[model samples]
Target: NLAPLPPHVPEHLVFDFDMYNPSNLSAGVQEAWAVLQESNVPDLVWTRCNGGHWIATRGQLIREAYEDYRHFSSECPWIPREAGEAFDFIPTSMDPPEQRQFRALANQVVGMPVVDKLENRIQELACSLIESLRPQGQCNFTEDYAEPFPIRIFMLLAGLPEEDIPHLKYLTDQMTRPDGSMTFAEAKEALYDYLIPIIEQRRQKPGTDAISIVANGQVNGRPITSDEAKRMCGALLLGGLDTVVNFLSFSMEFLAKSPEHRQELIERPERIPAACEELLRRFSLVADGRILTSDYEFHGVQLKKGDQILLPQMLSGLDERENAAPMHVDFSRQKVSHTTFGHGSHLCLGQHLARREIIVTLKEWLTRIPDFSIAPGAQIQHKSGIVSGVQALPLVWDPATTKAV
Candidate 1:
């Protein structure tokens, strides 16, 4: 149902697109969101759905809005008002100067230096997982490989037990793609409850784990408080648990269906890195935004204070203005442009780790199972929300085509 349009909003600017369940979702999540960039639609438009919010459809406006955080505050980033109010993750939920302090600590855990140390483990896990699935001839890609690989690596980094994945993943999922069983606030509190004891213990006797590092680390000269540590850890957990997990599904799903693309990567092993960059742009999945801090006129449109606007990171690369033949995946493209890891000061800290996982997956998976395709007579479905994802991706191949690694 559409909310009544505010008197401040003009009828010409209404778009009525829903973020959680976009109208064209069956076409694919990124494809659905790309509709906003069609020639006819205005760059900045208002949607009556999700309690009336603005959506920046073009990369131009999206970048501008993200860079100019003074007008587009991070305080309430999600839609429906309530969820955004409850989304109080540190660094991401805070703006510039204040956001910088915690981000440095987050970088300490998942930064390039940390990823370099964990490189061997990452490669080993990818090879082991791929080798395990080789002779099966068929498998549920999402459950069999996508979920376990990245989630396990993250658990190892955080020093958390593998057994706790189900509970933690469930809580994390509710925040992005809610099943309606729990509100964002409830899930957030549950996550905090789970972290409380862990943070307390780590502070007293620190370990080299990411959680311990954050728990015992200093912020602006003083030791970080337990509450602040929990918030930071909560943000880390959300990124660690969800982002890469869903992304692998999309990437693998595309590979399963596109044999030509797979063959190219296999034939030219050196192109894997570039292909990963192109794929990141083609299948980009996150869509989050900021709250309007005060009344402002953007691009000649009157945006009143308190209005929430969605600036989808997925759409930036998909916009034809930004890339030619935006939908096609070209590994050898001269320039692969995107905000997949995000932009400005809020760029994703775990990008180094994500790239490693993706490159390893592409190299190892193709080296063994050179030929694969979608399961016979099955239609893949995608779920839409703040972080869009594939529900399931079933892939099949011949054992004879596999190689023992």
Candidate 2:
């Protein structure tokens, strides 16, 4: 059901696209969202769906909104209005200098040297998982490799048990793409409930794990409150569990279908990193937004205080104006521009680690099972919401062609 468009919004600019259940979703998630960037639609249109909010359709508007956080506050970062209000993820909910303070502590857990430290583990797991699947001849890539590969590494880093993935991933999914089983507030509370004891235990006896680091770490030069620790750790868990896991499925799904693209990577392994960037661009998936802080006129449109606008990071690189032939994934493209990880001060903290996982997955997977395709007669399904994802990716290959190494 669509909400009534506010008086401030022009009727001509209305486009009733639902972020949670978008039209043309069967075509694919990115393709479904690209509907906004099509010619007749204005750069910014009021979507009566999801409680009636504005959607910034082009890269130019998205980047500007993200940079001008004063006008576009991170106060409510999600849609449906209710979810954004309850989205208490630290740094994400907080803006500017306040967001920066906790960012450093969060960075300590997932940033630079952290990935370097985990490189051997990352490569080892990729090879181990791919080799085990190589002989199987067929596997559900999403469950078999995509989920385990990234989630396991994150579980290890956070020192959380692997068994908790289902429970935590379910809760995180609810917050991003709700199934209507539970409200966002309920999911947020359940996540906090799980973390409370763990945070307490880690705080009492500081270990080398991520939770221990943040639970004991300070913010803004003062002792970080228990609430702050819980919020940040919850954010870390949500990020670690969701983003890269879903991204791997999309990248692999593309590789499974396009032999030429896979061959380009196989011929020049060094191009894997660059190909990763291009893939990130073509398949950019996260769509989040900021709230309007005051009554203002933007791009000749009047927006009121408390109004929310979804600035899809996914649409940035896909804008034909930003990149020529936006749909085609040319690995050789000199400028693979995108806010796939996000944009402005809130740029994703785990980007370095994400790139490492993607590059390693590409190199290692192709080396072993280079000639796989989507399972015969199997339909690939995609999910769209705050973060778009593949529901299932069944891949099949010949065991004879697979290399053990």
Candidate 3:
């Protein structure tokens, strides 16, 4: 539903784009937002959709807004305004100075060093999953591979039960993309209700698990409170459950369709890392915003206090100003620029783990099933929101072409 335009928003700068449900979402969310970067669209435009908010349509402004956290505070970072105002995820929901302390605590769980320790399991899981799925000849890639692969590993790391995924993932998704059935506040509460007890139990008896560490950990040289641990752990659940779960589907869906892109890695296995970066840039998804603390003029537009402006992380890579042929995925392309993981101080803490998961999935899957493609006569449907996603990905391949190793 489009919100009536405010008087301050100039008519010329208006482009009623809905992040949660774009006008051209049927085509694709990436393509839908790309319309904003076209020759006619301004660098900054206000969408009357979703309660009226400003959208940074170019890389420069997006990066600048993310960097200038003083004015563009992350106190509220969601669209429709309600979610942002209701947002309480640790570190991410907090701005600088105060944000850094919690970030350091979070890093102890999902940071690069943690990724280094998880590398072997990451590789093993990717192999085991791929090898099992390889001979299927056909599979719903989104469910069969995408959801289970990274999610199971995260469950193990967090000391969570796999059986709880249905409930937890629902809460995470509702917060990101509400189905009109629940409010962000309610969804967030449900998540906390599920986690608070788990966190309490972990604090009593800690273990060698990510949640245990966060539950019993210290922040700013003091013990983390049960409330604080629940906030941080809730965020951990959202990141772990949603991120790679959707990302793998996007990457594999592309590979299934693009043989040329597939062979680039199939022939030169070492290019997997660079290919991972390229894929991250190409399939980047995430559109969170910040609330204005004070009235200010940015890029010649008057932004009033309390106004929310979405600094879309997805638009950064797709901006023609940042990457040449922004939509084209070229693994060998030098100087790939993107804010997929994010920008400024809030860059993704789990990026290293995400990269390892992606790299491992690509190498392992293509090594045996290089000839796979989208299932004949099937179309991949994409859903748009805070984190855009593929509704389904039906993929097919030949069994005889695969090997056990």
Candidate 4:
């Protein structure tokens, strides 16, 4: 049930790599995508999957495309063209010079300074969530801890009610990994509908939360409009909710299975930071595309204007050329190279906050529960889309083996 390869696409280059549902996903998400970068694969190939777009299969082209945004625009940064046409997330939706202004304001909310300010709350929340699950012996990590840890922290930072998650999270997920239930516009409109009132509320009486800051903040020298604030917030909302939350699940799922990996972190707690980077490389999840602004040839492939190419941020670190034995997780990886947080002007803004959450989860969780694994007979599954995610993570540990940290 696949579409005919476009006449212009080379037959050999057509790999049929579907971002939404990769067929070769057996070892893991990263492994599934790594198949695209095998020695036989071209540096740049055209995929008939998802309506036929170009795919950069190596870190070199991926980084070059991101770095040279003048040619590869983020205006339509999604695959299956229609979704990108509907993508209006600020800064992400605009090119440089114009994008820079919104990024400045976005920084006010998720930049390093903001993470430094929220460090205590982030660490405190990680401990509270993990410790609460520690004594349970077994837990559905995705539901019980992974989802709650980063999300509740984000909700707290946004000053939004915890009860709003049912709808907000749904809307955010649709924007990233649509389930065929809603279009991006519908999702955007619904999310904005919820934010409209809160933005106006914060604008009138500012508070010490991300929402209030963005609602009242200025872009460049001029004050941002309510519409602009909403667009920017929509992007931030997705990042805060999706990035670290799923990332934690993937990282923990790996630790749960690899006893030696856990022992490394448990023995030398100081290596948690290093291990965090390695895991980020090994389990990098995001996969999004950029639209071509004009006809250009990249890595020997002829790309036409308005064509969308999936420049997977996740694949950058996974490239064997970028790292030795790319799929293997090495806590002592000296360089720990990766574009997991992304590259160029569109680089992830909340990475510092994300890193803190990951580090805290590792240091705190390992301290509390050193031995854990996937429940026996459980076959873990993964889902692929704009972001890759675990289907479920049923983690098991002996409460008797856990210690109070």
lDDT of each: 0.91, 0.92, 0.89, 0.88
The list of candidate 3 runs beyond 4 A from truth reads none
lDDT of 1 by residue, 1-405 (tens): 999999999899999998888888989888899889888999999999978999999988998899998999888988778999999998789998898889899889999999999889998988899899999999998889888999999999999999999999999999999989999999999999999999999888999999999999988788899999999999999987889989999998888889899999988999999999999999999999999999999999999999999988899999998999999989998988899988878999999999999999999999999899999988999999888898999999999989997
- What would the per-residue lDDT of candidate 2 be over residues 288-330, giving only the tens digit for each residue? 9999999889999999999999999999999998999999989
TM-scores for all candidates? Answer: 0.99, 0.99, 0.98, 0.97
The candidates, ranked best first by lDDT, are 2, 1, 3, 4
Given candidate 3, what's the lDDT at residue 173?
A: 86
Q: Which stretches of candidate 2 lie over 4 Å from their true place?
A: none
Lowest lDDT sum, 10 consecutive residues, model 2, at 1-10
Cα deviation in Å at residue 277, candidate 2? 0.2
Q: Evaluate residue 93 in candidate 3 and report its C-alpha lDDT on the 0 to 100 scale.
A: 89
Tell me how far the alpha carbon of residue 86 in candidate 4 is from the true structure, in angstroms, after superposition: 0.6
RMSD of each: 0.8, 0.8, 1.0, 1.3
Best by lDDT: 2
In model 1, what is the error at residue 58, expressed in angstroms?
0.1
